[PDB]
Design a binder for this molecule. Sequence first.
Ligand SMILES: CNC(=O)c1nc(C)n2ccc(Nc3nccc(-n4cc(N[C@@H]5CCOC[C@@H]5N)cn4)n3)cc12
Length: 267
Amino acid sequence: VYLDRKLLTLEDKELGSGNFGTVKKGYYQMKKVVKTVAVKILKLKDELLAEANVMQQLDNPYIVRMIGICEAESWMLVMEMAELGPLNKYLQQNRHVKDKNIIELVHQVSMGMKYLEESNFVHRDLAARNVLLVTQHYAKISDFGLSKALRADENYYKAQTHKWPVKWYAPECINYYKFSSKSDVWSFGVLMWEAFSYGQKPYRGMKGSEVTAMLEKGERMGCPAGCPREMYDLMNLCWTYDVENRPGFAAVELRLRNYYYDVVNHH
Ligand SMILES: CNC(=O)c1nc(C)n2ccc(Nc3nccc(-n4cc(N[C@@H]5CCOC[C@@H]5N)cn4)n3)cc12
């Protein structure tokens, strides 16, 4: 859990910011090899510790691995490096990634979210900026800063006061401050839209209030160019207003698994 700073080599040039601070590339001298790492630097500490506490409990191929934490110049969250970076930035810079490949990546995210749902954890920040690419064909979920372990007696987490990405938030998050695996299903639908739109921001040119007003009328974002009808149908199903009627990640992952192999068969 607690790493030796002397074994941690940090690169001078940062990968970027992120509201919590900065993301840096480094190396952690392991048992026999060297491990390339992405480090979240604080430069709030309670939030970094809670994020690391969540990530330590997670063991899945589609969730970023936390190597550990390190208390030095600043508090550091050390993760296994996914070299290609955020899914949204990647797709914005590689607009010729095939449709089959987008299905493959969004299906990988649903597999990680299926695992997260079974573990009874709520992510609360499921966005394409929080999906990291190991390879063009390998996605992982990172950014567990707003993540919650659900109580043994409740299916939701209730926030006590609203700095919220409203464009990814389900109506019950807004109206009742209630966060569940089904609200992550809503955000996953927004994430699908972003990915099929090659990293375009959702609800372009709209205020958070205008987004809520649109969703309340029953209006939804349109089909991104080239997106198969079946994928846009799944997107819309993730955007079911009623929490109970909205599918869980086991149903969402199965629709994606089947459609992915169907597209793999056609090809
Ligand atoms: C700030 N920019 C980058 O993070 C970034 N830029 C480039 C060019 N990268 C390349 C590889 C890489 N790898 C990598 N692997 C494992 C974990 C991470 N984590 C990054 C975050 N937090 C970010 C907050 C800011 O938004 C993006 C993220 N969600 C959480 N985990 N990162 C990251 C980046």
